Enzyme design. Structure first.
Site, PDB file in Angstrom:
ATOM      1  N   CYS A 159       0.801  -1.215   0.000  1.00 31.13           N
ATOM      2  CA  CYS A 159       0.000   0.000   0.000  1.00 31.13           C
ATOM      3  C   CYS A 159       0.854   1.295   0.000  1.00 31.13           C
ATOM      4  CB  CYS A 159      -1.157  -0.202   1.045  1.00 31.13           C
ATOM      5  SG  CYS A 159      -2.293   1.181   1.349  1.00 31.13           S
ATOM      6  N   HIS A 163      -3.995  -5.105   0.501  1.00 32.79           N
ATOM      7  CA  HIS A 163      -3.532  -5.605   1.788  1.00 32.79           C
ATOM      8  C   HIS A 163      -3.452  -7.125   1.844  1.00 32.79           C
ATOM      9  CE1 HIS A 163      -3.349  -1.923   4.190  1.00 32.79           C
ATOM     10  NE2 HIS A 163      -4.145  -1.462   3.238  1.00 32.79           N
ATOM     11  N   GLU A 221      -2.206  -9.012   3.813  1.00 32.08           N
ATOM     12  CA  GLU A 221      -2.413  -9.475   5.160  1.00 32.08           C
ATOM     13  C   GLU A 221      -3.868  -9.372   5.564  1.00 32.08           C
ATOM     14  OE1 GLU A 221      -1.804  -6.531   4.360  1.00 32.08           O
ATOM     15  OE2 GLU A 221      -2.764  -5.130   5.770  1.00 32.08           O
TER      16      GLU A 221
END
Ligand SMILES: Nc1ncnc2c1ncn2[C@@H]1O[C@H](COP(=O)(O)OP(=O)(O)O)[C@@H](O)[C@H]1O
Ligand SMILES: Nc1ncnc2c1ncn2[C@@H]1O[C@H](COP(=O)(O)OP(=O)(O)O)[C@@H](O)[C@H]1O
Ligand SMILES: O=c1[nH]cnc2c1ncn2[C@@H]1O[C@H](COP(=O)(O)O)[C@@H](O)[C@H]1O
Ligand SMILES: CC[N+](CC)(CC)CC
Ligand SMILES: NCCC[C@H](N)C(=O)O
Ligand SMILES: NCCC[C@H](N)C(=O)O
Ligand SMILES: [Cl-]
Ligand SMILES: [Cl-]
Ligand SMILES: [Cl-]
Ligand SMILES: [K+]
Ligand SMILES: [K+]
Ligand SMILES: [K+]
Ligand SMILES: [K+]
Ligand SMILES: [K+]
Ligand SMILES: [K+]
Ligand SMILES: [K+]
Ligand SMILES: [Mn+2]
Ligand SMILES: [Mn+2]
Ligand SMILES: [Mn+2]
Lengths: 1058, 379
Positions: free
Chosen positions: B268, B352, B354
């Site tokens: 990001c 993202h 994650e």
């Protein structure tokens, strides 16, 4: 990646007639699949025995076969069409079963038919519960403790292991068919025996109990590229233990943390990957222990379903359309998302900005001795769906669109009933169809949310919300109508409260509440469904009402709008036939240039498909809801005559409220419905009506009965009384009195009147006599026994009535033919459930036609003036739900109980009949031993029948009296004893499979009650049986035909008409 | 009646109810389509100075819990929702939504037409706004505050959220069975990665830890020099709030790393920095991508991933240095989502990987990073 080039023609396996657990959702999905395959330039072939399907519309496919969904028949179709491939994921379990049968029979190989969508191995891996359990274990997913059983012995051992209660689930079944929960050995034995015999693989999975755990579903989609998406998550309102189809369910999931959600998401994808679904959708089910989030996989359905249909409707993501295309090589990334103007791909996961609620629709009241508690085996006959910006608002709207007389949380029990807390506890602890209302009544009664939780295992998340609605209700009742200030009233509205419910609480008329809202400028806004929580614009007009700020309706001022009112959830008597009609009106008038607005909330239907109309308002079909739409749409005309009873009941009020209701007037309809008004009209025309009366008191009726003469038709649960004693008898147990016309032939006539002329749509002759409800009767078009002469009178009577009543569109007239004389049963100034059948047989789309007529286009103008009399025979047969309610006596009568129907086409009535019969899942054989046990009146006729069978080579058995008459005729049947007469008795013989056919007629209340055993035994044992002599005759006729001999496409049939 | 009000730069007002602390909140207004994941979303540093509107009506159904915090605190400036449920109903709940909000001193409003706000933000683009919660929320004041809001464009927000001192991170991911693990021992981690804290999410760290990385979290302004001194196995660039462009130091340091053969990975804001340090340009998106159902294609493999997004800025594809190859693209809008240095062991991702909250679809992105690492040690 693009479309597959090796395939040009596809065979789509349809679902067949509507049954509990397998309904309309399959016409929606099938129609979608066809549309999507035709759109993509493929040659479309489909089989579907149900004629009231849009999917069977001629123009929807290249080759349409309304034939028995029998593997032998399917083989002819294949042999004749040489489809390159077969799509078996769009016809419910019938389609799954069939596909695998053909495969097994080696037909697929034989004609090089490629199975697309789901491979036979994937399908079995999922349907065979042994395999499914293995698979889960392979991927390390957890399943409940279970055991496979192929015999009762096998089964009992499992029960010993898992203990009671235990869940019994057959391999190769769906909708809980053949399953249940067993609380004891006796229940166990019973469910297992039923399940074992029902399972196409004769297998059962028996699992330990997880009853009370949270229950979830996920609709997934995967492509050849391994792209996989979750289209929709679903949280069941009713916990594990009540089938999802009999459960109130909501989208999306509500009580799962993201963390749990992802686990479930991953698991779902893992499921499809292991089962092997790579090019289509699938429904995956789970159970979650709310105390620790423990995840357990329950099952997966390698096809479109009732949930996928719900999900589609809920999200605006047309799963079946997408799946169809996936079946032919397309990938999600290549498809566009329809609702976002196709500006976004199909490869994404929908996000919704509202709550979707589904409530099942039951009809227990039609099933006398049926157990009415909810269990793992579906019992619902339909469903309603609603959307609201809030769960409270979503749930209440659904309630008022359920078509049960609810206006929301209407009380079931009284406050000052000392016993109430008892009934309430019971209703909670062991859920029935009424539980939702009991939950509210419990709160009114002082029960806590925890108290309720403990009995129902329904998440407190939902409970607290119902409690709040209650407290609000209390406030309302307290402050009354004066307390209904704009702020408070708006609060109420926003919570989903109906004018009707407030009205009741405030102790005023519903119109009073509406006036108030009118005074306050309190109106809902319309939001649109878009698949993406408004992240992308939409060009589609699929809307729902809500009490918020911004409206997205943006009605058009450009066109002449036509509104079509649906019938809400389906129920017995108000099926798909009506939706079908509704769909047609829309397609018709749309095509013609009108802006078509459809109003309905049945998530299973094609009418609630955004593509069916210009504007779709997925709303409750209520006066309130309909008036609000009219307020803003300011349409040109409203059609109330095509959605059944729901919209018909509204007609008067709408019109009075100012709605431009088109076609046959409310008043005209009332003229026909109203007993008094009707009788009065019949007279005026000087025609035949059975002697009747209106009684008040008992003795009143005994005397009046005397007048009219017996036997009588008593309408309050309508029964046929044969004597004074019988009359009296009914009375205790218990007003309209009508003379019953015994040994009469019932006729149905569908027709259109433009006030200028009358078009005879179709004259159908009932195989079953008057007395067997038309809805449960097999019928023939054209008439198969009636004389032309007699048929001409009817035609004549139809015409007189048409004009006199001022029909403007469709009508249906019911006649009884006794002694060459014609009597008038009733007039139905609207579209009848026979319309789709007739349209399919004659080639004329009556609904389309009458639609145009109501909209101002004459029959002449249309060019539809002459009555079609087909060059072939079309026979309609029904399917009954008895098997679902074993405690009921599986016998025909004056009350309708059928859930669906099938069509049979033939060169001869016998051909048509045999086709209709096979299509109806009959178990009739061409040989064996037939049992004859008929009532007195049938005694004379039965000889011929006994003769026909003998001719057919059958061996006969007969009960005492019946044998008497036969012997007196030279026919010496084998004697069998009635149960009460001792061994060997019918029950034993039936059970021991000594018969392949049974003809059992009975007349009289106790007489029926007493012979209940034979019919129940017949049903349980799978022996084809007729409960009418006429049916018996027709069956015998069909013995001479071969339904697997010749096949014909609707297109072909249609082309044979002159 | 606990009143609350939300006013947009443009004068649009939204009247509702207060569910958070008492006061005022000012920031750029955004909408997030995630139907689950509210706690994680509020606790993501990337939301600092932004007013978060949730499109999914019922927010708080499952209450809150520590395990679901993506950072030390709630970074979201304000919270705007449609409905605050009567109760939290989830075994993992430790405190109801409103209470958490109050405890975190957050100004929040409910009972407003989030759909109209969404459509407005979609059509007109992001807007600054102000939420006032109290007895008599002033609408003019609110509008003043919103108009006054300096705005996110050109705003370095990384230096504002970064850590003060450097530190170690050795805690891995949560599991349903045992919850959040005990931070590992340093000898339990083969690999040592240095992560620039630009307002890093805990899930990123934990996931790296799951992959064998012991971490050294460094303040946003750390010098490449200071770093290198640490002999890192790999360098990681976190996500974070604001505009990446104004972060000269980061760009500077990265560029430096790009001289070296050290493996670099960014997520990001990290992705943007990496693009900047490489010669690419950054732009402010109309309304950005904030949700968890975002289709992103791996152009190389022609595979689609359902991803979790949270960005208002993007790398312009038509300004990408030839040493910068496009690796992924948004299937929603064609915007740039992934890039790879043709000449260096460096790559990044706009989304993202994650998740937290969201789909696990993008997690493999981490593995390429580990690959690089492993190979660099070979050498
Ligand atoms: N171990 C179990 N304990 C309790 N209920 C169960 C269990 N397994 C399944 N059920 C219930 O039975 C219903 C039907 O089971 P299912 O596997 O979905 O069969 P079908 O294929 O007929 O739909 C589920 O929707 C659920 O409510
Ligand atoms: N007087 C009668 N004589 C014989 N059969 C009758 C008579 N009245 C009704 N029936 C039978 O009962 C059924 C239901 O009656 P009907 O008036 O049409 O009720 P519904 O409103 O459900 O259509 C008919 O389809 C028919 O078989
Ligand atoms: O086991 C039974 N118990 C009671 N009635 C029966 C039984 N089996 C057949 N019947 C009825 O017996 C009638 C025929 O009686 P029969 O006149 O002696 O042949 C029919 O109306 C059947 O429903
Ligand atoms: C559910 C539909 N059936 C099983 C597939 C039973 C009537 C058709 C035979
Ligand atoms: N709701 C009617 C207009 C719809 C418009 N294209 C939009 O998506 O905003
Ligand atoms: N159309 C009704 C089905 C007929 C059934 N076999 C019966 O005779 O009861
Ligand atoms: Cl089934
Ligand atoms: Cl457990
Ligand atoms: Cl029953
Ligand atoms: K083939
Ligand atoms: K299954
Ligand atoms: K359930
Ligand atoms: K299901
Ligand atoms: K009949
Ligand atoms: K009727
Ligand atoms: K408001
Ligand atoms: Mn199933
Ligand atoms: Mn199921
Ligand atoms: Mn009737």
């Amino acid at each position: 990646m693009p479309k597959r080039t090796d395939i040009k023609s596809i065979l789509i396996l349809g679902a067949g007639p509507i049954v509990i657990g397998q309904a309309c959702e399959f016409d929606y999905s099938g129609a979608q699949a066809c549309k999507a395959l035709r759109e993509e330039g493929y040659r479309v072939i489909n089989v579907n025995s149900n004629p009231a399907t849009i999917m069977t519309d001629p123009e929807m496919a290249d080759a349409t076969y309304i034939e028995p969904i029998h593997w032998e028949v399917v083989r002819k179709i294949i042999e004749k069409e040489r489809p390159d491939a077969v799509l078996p994921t769009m016809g419910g379990q019938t389609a799954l079963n069939c596909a695998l049968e053909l495969e097994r029979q080696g037909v697929l190989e034989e004609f090089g038919v490629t199975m697309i969508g789901a491979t036979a191995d994937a399908i079995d891996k999922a349907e065979d519960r042994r395999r499914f359990d293995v698979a889960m274990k392979k991927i390390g997913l957890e399943t409940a403790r279970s055991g496979i059983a192929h015999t009762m012995e096998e089964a009992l051992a499992v029960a010993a292991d898992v203990g009671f209660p235990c869940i019994i689930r057959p391999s190769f079944t769906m909708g809980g068919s053949g399953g249940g929960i067993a609380y004891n050995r006796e229940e166990f034995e019973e469910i297992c025996a039923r399940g074992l015999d029902l399972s196409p693989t004769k297998e059962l999975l028996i699992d330990e109990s997880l009853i009370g755990w949270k229950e979830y579903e996920m609709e997934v989609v995967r492509d050849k590229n391994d792209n996989c998406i979750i289209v929709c998550s679903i949280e069941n309102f009713d916990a594990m233990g009540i089938h999802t189809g009999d459960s109130i369910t909501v989208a999306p999931a509500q009580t799962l943390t993201d963390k749990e959600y992802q686990i479930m998401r991953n698991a779902s994808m893992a499921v499809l990957r292991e089962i092997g679904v790579e090019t289509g959708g699938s429904n995956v089910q789970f159970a979650v222990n709310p105390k620790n989030g423990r995840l357990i996989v329950i099952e997966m359905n390698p096809r479109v379903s009732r949930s996928s249909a719900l999900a589609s409707k809920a999200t605006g993501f047309p799963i079946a359309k997408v799946a169809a295309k996936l079946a032919v090589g397309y990938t999600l990334d290549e498809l566009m998302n329809d609702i976002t103007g196709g500006r976004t791909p199909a490869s994404f996961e929908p996000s919704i900005d509202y709550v979707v609620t589904k409530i099942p629709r039951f009809n227990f009241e039609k099933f006398a001795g049926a157990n009415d508690r909810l269990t793992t085996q579906m019992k619902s006959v339909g469903e309603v769906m609603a959307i609201g910006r809030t769960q409270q608002e979503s749930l209440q709207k659904a309630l008022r669109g359920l078509e049960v007389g609810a206006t929301g949380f209407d009380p079931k029990v009284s406050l000052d009933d000392p016993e109430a807390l008892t009934k309430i506890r019971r209703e909670l602890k062991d859920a029935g169809a009424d539980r939702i209302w009991y939950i509210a009544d419990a709160f009114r009664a002082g029960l806590s949310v925890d108290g309720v939780f403990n009995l129902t295992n329904i998440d407190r998340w939902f409970l607290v919300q119902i409690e709040e609605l209650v407290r609000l209700e209390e406030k309302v009742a307290e402050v009354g109508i004066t307390g209904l200030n704009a702020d408070f009233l708006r609060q109420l509205k926003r919570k989903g409260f109906a004018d009707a419910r407030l009205a009741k609480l405030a102790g005023v008329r519903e119109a009073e509440i509406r006036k108030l809202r009118d005074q306050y400028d309190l109106h809902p806004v319309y939001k649109r469904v878009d698949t993406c929580a408004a992240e992308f614009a939409t060009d589609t007009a699929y809307m729902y009402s809500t009490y918020e700020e911004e409206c997205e309706a943006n009605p058009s001022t450009d066109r002449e709008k036509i509104m079509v009112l649906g019938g809400g959830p389906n129920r017995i008597g108000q099926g798909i036939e009506f939706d079908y009609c509704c769909v047609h009106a829309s397609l018709a008038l749309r095509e013609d240039g009108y802006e078509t607005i459809m109003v309905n909330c049945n998530p299973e239907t094609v009418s609630t498909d955004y593509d069916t109309s210009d504007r779709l308002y997925f709303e409750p079909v209520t006066l309130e809801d309909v008036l609000e739409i009219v307020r803003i749409e300011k349409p040109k005309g409203v059609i109330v005559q095509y959605g059944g009873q729901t919209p018909l009941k509204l007609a008067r009020a709408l019109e009075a409220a100012g709605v431009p209701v088109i076609g046959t007037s409310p008043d005209a309809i009332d003229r026909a419905e109203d007993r008094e008004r009707f009788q009065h009209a019949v007279e005026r025309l000087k025609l035949k009506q059975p002697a009747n009366a209106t009684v008040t008191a008992i003795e009143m009726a005994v005397e009046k009965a005397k007048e009219i003469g017996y036997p009588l038709v008593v309408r309050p649960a309508m029964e046929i009384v044969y004597d004074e004693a019988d009359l009296r008898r009914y009375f205790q147990t218990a007003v309209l009195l009508d003379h019953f016309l015994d040994d009469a032939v019932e006729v149905d006539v569908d027709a259109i009147c433009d006030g200028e002329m009358v078009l005879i749509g179709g004259i159908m002759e009932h195989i079953e006599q008057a007395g067997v409800h038309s809805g449960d009767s097999a019928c023939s078009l054209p008439a198969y026994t009636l004389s032309q002469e007699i048929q001409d009178v009817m035609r004549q009577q139809v015409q007189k009535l048409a004009f006199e009543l001022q029909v403007r569109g469709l009508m249906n007239v019911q006649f009884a033919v006794k002694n060459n004389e014609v009597y008038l049963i009733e007039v139905n100034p609207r579209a009848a459930r026979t319309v789709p059948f007739v349209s399919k047989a004659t080639g004329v789309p009556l609904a389309k036609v009458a639609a145009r007529v109501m909209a101002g286009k004459s029959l002449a103008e249309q060019g539809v003036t002459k009555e079609v009399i087909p060059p072939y025979y079309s026979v309609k047969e029904v399917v009954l739900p008895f098997n679902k309610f074993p405690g009921v006596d599986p016998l025909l009568g004056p009350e309708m109980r059928s859930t669906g129907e099938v069509m049979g086409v033939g060169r001869t009535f016998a051909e048509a009949f045999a086709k209709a019969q096979l299509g109806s899942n009959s178990t009739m054989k061409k040989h064996g031993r037939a049992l004859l046990s008929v009532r007195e009146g049938d005694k004379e006729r039965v000889v011929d029948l006994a003769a026909k069978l003998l001719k057919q080579g059958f061996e006969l058995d007969a009960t005492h009296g019946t044998a008497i008459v036969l012997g007196e005729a030279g026919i010496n049947p084998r004697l069998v004893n009635k149960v009460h007469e001792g061994r060997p008795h019918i029950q034993d013989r039936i059970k021991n499979g000594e018969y392949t056919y049974i003809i059992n007629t009975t007349s009289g209340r106790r007489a029926i009650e007493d012979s209940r055993v034979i019919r129940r035994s017949a049903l349980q044992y799978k022996v084809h049986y007729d409960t009418t002599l006429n049916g018996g005759f027709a069956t015998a006729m069909a013995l001479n035909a071969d339904a697997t001999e010749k096949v014909i496409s609707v297109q072909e049939m249609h082309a044979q008409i002159k | 009646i606990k009143s609350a009000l939300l006013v947009l730069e443009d004068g649009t007002q939204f009247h509702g109810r207060a569910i958070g602390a008492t006061g005022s909140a000012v920031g750029e207004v955004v909408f997030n389509t995630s139907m689950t994941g509210y706690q994680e979303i509020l606790t993501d540093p990337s939301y600092s100075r932004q007013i978060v509107t949730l499109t999914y009506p019922h927010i708080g159904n499952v209450g809150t819990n520590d395990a679901d915090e993506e950072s030390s605190q709630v970074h979201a400036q304000g919270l705007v929702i449609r409905d605050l449920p009567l109760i939290a109903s989830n075994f993992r709940n430790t405190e109801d939504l409103s209470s958490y909000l109050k405890r975190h001193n957050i100004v929040a409003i409910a009972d407003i037409d989030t759909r109209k706000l969404t459509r407005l933000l979609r059509e007109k683009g992001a807007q600054n706004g102000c939420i006032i919660a109290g007895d008599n929320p002033d609408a003019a004041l609110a509008l003043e505050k919103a108009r006054a809001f300096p705005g996110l464009n050109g705003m370095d927000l990384a230096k504002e959220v970064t850590t003060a001192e450097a530190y170690s991170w050795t805690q891995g991911s949560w599991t349903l069975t045992g919850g959040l693990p005990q931070a590992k021992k340093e000898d339990e981690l083969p690999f040592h990665v240095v992560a620039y804290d630009f307002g890093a999410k805990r899930n990123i760290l934990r996931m790296l830890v799951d992959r064998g990385c012991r971490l050294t979290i460094v303040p946003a302004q750390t010098s490449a020099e200071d770093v290198l001194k640490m002999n890192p196995d790999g360098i990681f660039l976190s996500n974070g709030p604001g505009d990446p462009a104004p972060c000269d130091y980061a760009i500077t340091a990265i560029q430096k790393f790009l001289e070296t053969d050290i493996p670099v990975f960014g997520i990001c804001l990290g992705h943007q920095l990496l693009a900047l340090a490489s010669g690419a340009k950054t732009v402010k998106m109309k309304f950005g991508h904030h949700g968890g159902n975002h289709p992103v294609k791996d152009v190389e493999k022609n595979v689609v991933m359902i991803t979790a997004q949270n960005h208002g800025f993007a790398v312009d594809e038509a300004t990408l240095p030839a040493n910068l190859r496009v690796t992924h693209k948004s299937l929603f809008d064609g915007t740039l989502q992934g890039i790879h240095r043709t000449d260096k062991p460096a790559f990044s991702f706009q989304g993202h990987p994650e998740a937290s909250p969201g789909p696990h679809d993008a997690a493999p992105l981490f593995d390429h990073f580990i690959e690089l690492i492993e190979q660099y040690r070979k050498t």
